[PDB]
Amino acid sequence: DGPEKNYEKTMAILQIEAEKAELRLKELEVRRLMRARGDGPWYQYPTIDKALIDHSPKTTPDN
Amino acid sequence: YGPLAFVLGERTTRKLTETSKVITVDGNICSGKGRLAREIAEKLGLRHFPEAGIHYADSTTGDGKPLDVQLSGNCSLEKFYDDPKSNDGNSYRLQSWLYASRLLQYADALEHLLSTGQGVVLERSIYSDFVFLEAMYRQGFIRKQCVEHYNEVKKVTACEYLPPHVVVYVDVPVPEIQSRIQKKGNPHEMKITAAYLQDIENAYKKTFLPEMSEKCEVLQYSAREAEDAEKVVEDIEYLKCDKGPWPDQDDRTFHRLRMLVQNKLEVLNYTTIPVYLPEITIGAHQSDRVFQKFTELPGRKYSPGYNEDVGDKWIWLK
C-alpha cells in the first residue's frame, strides 16, 4: 500500500499506547492515594454496621 | 456397580446361598484334577474355570483367542520343560506370568460369585501357585531373588482376597504321575524329572494343605477316590460351613471386594512392582516395540467398542 497508510496507523497506535501509559501512571497514583487516605470507593475495609445497635430502653438507666 | 449401587440397596449377602462357594481342586502335575473339577461343577451347579494358562488373559480380553507369545506372556512352558535352567529367565518369567494369570482368574471368579451368586470351581489357585515356584527353587531352576520377588508380589495381592471355602486335593503318587506323563504323549512333559514332582508334592503336603486346613476344610482323595464325583459332591454338601472367613464377612467388606475385583488394572496393580530382576526386566527398546506391536493388533488400539477396524460403528456419536 501507500507509505501514508503505515504513517497514519503508526500515529493511531502511538496515540493509543501513550493514552495507555498515562492511564497506567494515573491508576497507580490513584490507588496509592486511595490506600493512603481511604477516602475513595477502593480500599473501603468494612466496619461494624450501626443497624445492629439496639436503641431500646435497657435495664439500667445510665444505658 | 459402584458406591451408588451399595447405597441404593444392592447387597451381595442377599445373593449368597448354600452353593455360593469357591471350590479349588488342587493336585500334582497330570493328577486328573481337571475332570474332578468339571464333574464337581456339573453336579453342584457351579461355574467351572479351567486352570489359567499363559493365554488366559487373552480369553477374557478381546476376541477370546490367544495372542502371540511375544505379546501375551513372553514365556513358554515347553521351553521350561526342555531347558529349566535357561539364562533367559524363562522359568521365573513363566511362573510370575502364571501367578498373574491366576490372580486375574481368582478376581473374575470372585466377581462372578459376588454378582451372579453362582459358585465357582477353580483348578488350583494363587494360594497353590507357590508350590511350583518352591519346586523350581529347590531344583535350582530359579535363584533366591526370584523367590523373594514372588513373595513380595504375592503378599500385597493375595491379602485382599478371601481363601476358597473348600480345598479339594487329589493325591496321585509320584510314580503313577510319571507313568501317566510317559503315557500322555507330550515329549516336553516327558522331559519332567522326578525330583521336580517330588518337591511339588512335598510343598503341597507340607505348606499348602496344612495352612489351608488351618483356615477351612480340606477334602482329600486318591486316584480311585477322585473318580466318584457323587462321593466328592456329597462331601461338599455336608461340610461344616464354619470353615473359612466368609461367615465373618458383611456387606462392607463385600462391597470393598466387589469394587476391587471389577477393576482388573487395580487387581494387577502390584503385579508390575518395580523390582528390576534380570529375569523379568524388559528393556526400554523391547518394551516400546512390543507395546507398539500390541497396539497394532485388531481391536487393541482404542478402548473396546471404539475400534472401527473390527466393525465398531457409531463412534462419532459413541
Binding site: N6, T10, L14, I16, E17, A18, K20, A21 | Q292
Partner: protein, 459 residues
C-alpha cells in the same frame, strides 16, 4: 503480520491430520510456502517500522530474522527426516509440532511490540527446545545438557522479567515505539546499574558471553541435528535482537557499564577460537566457533555505533546460516560413521566429492571470506571497534587468524588425507543432504548481491 502467524498455526492440524506417508512432504511444502510469503516482510521503509497492528510490528532488524526462521524450518525438517525414520508416526508428528511451535514462538518474538510479550514468547521458546534436546537426543548427556541450558537461560531471564515489570510500573508502558520516543537518560546510581544488569544479563546468557557460554557446547553436542540448527541459527540471535532492542533505555550508563562485557567478549573470542584449534569433537568445535562469532556481535551491540549495529545484524544472519550448514555437514558425517570424533573418519574428500565442496564453501564462509556477508559484518564490526579504540585491531586480527586456522584445520582433518581403512559404511551422499547444503549455501551467496537487506535498520 497474521499472514505468517496463522499458516504457522495451521501447520499443526495439517501435520496431525496427514497420512503417515505425507507428514514430511506436506510440512516441507507449506513451510517453504510460509517462507515465500514471509519474504514480503523485507520491504522495509527507510525511517519508520512496519506497524501492522497494536501487537505486532517489523523493522529492518526483525524482517531478516523472521525470513531466516521461516527458511530454516524446512531445512530442519529435511535434516531430521533421516534419523527420525524408524520412529512411530505419533512421535514424528510430535517432533514436527515441536519444531512448528518453536518457529511460531520465534516469529511472535521477532514481531512483538510489547517488551513483556517479547519476554513471554522468548522464554516460551525454551520448552520446545528443551523437549527436543532431552527427548530425541542420542547420548546420555542430553539430560544434563537440557538442564544446563534451561537453568542458564532462566537465571539470566528472571531478573529481566523483574526489570521489565519495574519499567512498566515507572514509565507506564513497555511498547517499543513509546519506550523509544519517551526515552530518558539513566543516572549513575546503584539502582540504575542493577536495572541495567538485569536488562543485559538475560540476553548475554542467550548469545553466549564468555563465562556464561558453558551451556552452548553441551546443548549443541547432545541435541539432535534440527535442535542444534535452531539453537545455532535463531536462538542465539534472540539475545542479540533483544539487546539491540533494549539498549535504547539503557543509555548513557552503557558507556561505563559495557567495559566488563566488552573485555570479556574481546578475550573470549580469542579463547574460544584457540579452543576450536584444539578440539576433538566436530560439534563442540562448531559450538565454540559459534561462541567466538557471537562475541563480535556482543562487542558491536555494546559499542552502539551505526556501523556496529549493521555489522551485528549482518554477522547474525551470516553466522546463523554458516553454523546451521556446518552442523548439517557434521550430522551427515555422524549418520555415516555413528561417531562425532573428528579424527575417526578421514580422507572423505575421495569418497564424497560434492560433500567436500560443501565443506570447503562452508569453511570459507565461516572464516569470513570476501565478499560474503560474514566478512561484511565482521569488517563493519572491526571498523566500529577500531573507531572505538585503535588497540582493538590486535585482538580482531588475532581472532580472524585463529578462525581461519581452525576452519581450515577442520577442513583438512575431515575432508582430506588418507581414507579410514576399516570404515566401509560410507555410502554415496543422498540427494536430500546435497539439497540441504545447497539450500543452506545459495541464499548465503545471493545475499552478497543485495547486502542492504540484512544490514539492519541503520542502513
Amino acid at each position: 503480520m497474521l499472514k505468517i502467524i496463522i499458516p504457522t498455526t495451521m501447520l499443526l492440524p495439517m501435520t496431525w491430520m496427514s497420512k503417515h506417508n505425507m507428514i514430511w512432504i506436506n510440512a516441507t511444502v507449506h513451510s517453504l510456502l510460509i517462507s515465500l510469503i514471509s519474504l514480503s516482510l523485507l520491504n522495509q521503509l527507510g525511517e519508520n517500522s512496519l506497524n501492522f497492528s497494536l501487537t505486532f510490528f517489523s523493522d529492518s532488524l526483525s524482517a531478516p530474522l523472521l525470513v531466516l526462521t521461516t527458511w530454516l524450518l524446512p531445512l530442519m525438517l529435511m535434516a531430521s527426516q533421516s534419523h527420525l525414520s524408524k520412529e512411530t508416526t505419533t512421535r514424528k508428528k510430535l517432533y514436527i509440532t515441536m519444531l512448528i511451535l518453536l518457529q511460531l514462538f520465534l516469529i511472535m518474538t521477532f514481531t512483538a511490540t510489547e517488551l513483556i510479550l517479547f519476554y513471554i514468547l522468548f522464554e516460551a521458546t525454551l520448552v520446545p527446545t528443551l523437549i527436543i534436546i532431552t527427548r530425541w537426543g542420542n547420548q546420555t548427556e542430553r539430560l544434563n545438557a537440557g538442564l544446563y541450558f534451561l537453568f542458564y537461560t532462566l537465571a539470566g531471564s528472571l531478573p529481566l522479567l523483574v526489570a521489565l515489570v519495574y519499567i512498566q510500573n515507572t514509565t507506564g508502558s513497555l511498547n517499543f515505539l513509546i519506550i523509544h520516543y519517551w526515552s530518558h537518560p539513566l543516572s549513575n546510581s546503584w539502582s540504575n546499574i542493577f536495572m541495567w544488569l538485569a536488562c543485559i544479563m538475560a540476553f548475554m546468557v542467550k548469545m553466549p558471553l564468555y563465562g556464561l557460554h558453558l551451556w552452548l557446547p553441551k546443548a549443541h553436542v547432545e541435541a539432535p541435528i534440527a535442535g542444534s540448527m535452531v539453537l545455532a541459527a535463531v536462538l542465539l540471535k534472540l539475545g542479540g535482537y533483544g539487546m539491540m532492542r533494549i539498549t535504547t533505555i539503557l543509555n548513557p550508563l552503557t558507556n561505563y557499564m559495557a567495559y566488563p562485557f566488552l573485555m570479556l567478549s574481546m578475550w573470549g573470542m580469542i579463547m574460544t577460537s584457540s579452543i576450536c584449534l584444539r578440539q576433538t569433537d566436530l560439534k563442540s568445535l562448531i559450538a565454540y566457533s559459534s561462541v567466538s562469532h557471537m562475541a563480535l556481535v556482543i562487542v558491536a551491540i555494546m559499542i552502539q555505533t551505526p556501523w556496529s549495529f549493521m555489522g551485528a545484524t549482518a554477522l547474525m544472519i551470516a553466522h546463523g546460516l554458516t553454523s546451521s550448514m556446518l552442523f548439517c555437514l557434521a550430522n551427515t558425517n555422524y549418520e555415516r560413521v555413528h561417531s562425532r570424533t573428528m579424527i575417526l573418519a578421514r580422507g572423505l574428500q575421495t569418497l564424497l566429492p560434492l560433500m567436500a565442496t560443501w565443506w570447503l564453501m562452508a569453511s570459507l564462509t565461516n572464516l569470513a571470506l570476501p565478499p560474503s556477508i560474514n566478512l561484511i559484518g565482521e569488517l563493519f564490526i572491526i571498523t566500529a571497534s577500531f573507531s572505538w579504540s585503535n588497540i582493538t585491531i590486535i585482538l580482531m586480527g588475532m581472532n580472524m587468524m585463529i578462525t581461519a586456522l581452525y576452519s581450515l584445520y577442520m577442513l583438512i582433518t575431515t575432508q582430506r588425507g588418507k581414507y579410514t581403512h576399516h570404515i566401509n559404511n560410507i555410502k554415496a551422499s543422498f540427494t536430500r543432504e546435497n539439497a540441504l547444503m545447497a539450500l543452506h549455501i545459495l541464499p548465503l551467496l545471493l545475499l552478497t548481491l543485495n547486502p542492504k537487506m540484512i544490514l539492519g535498520p541503520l542502513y
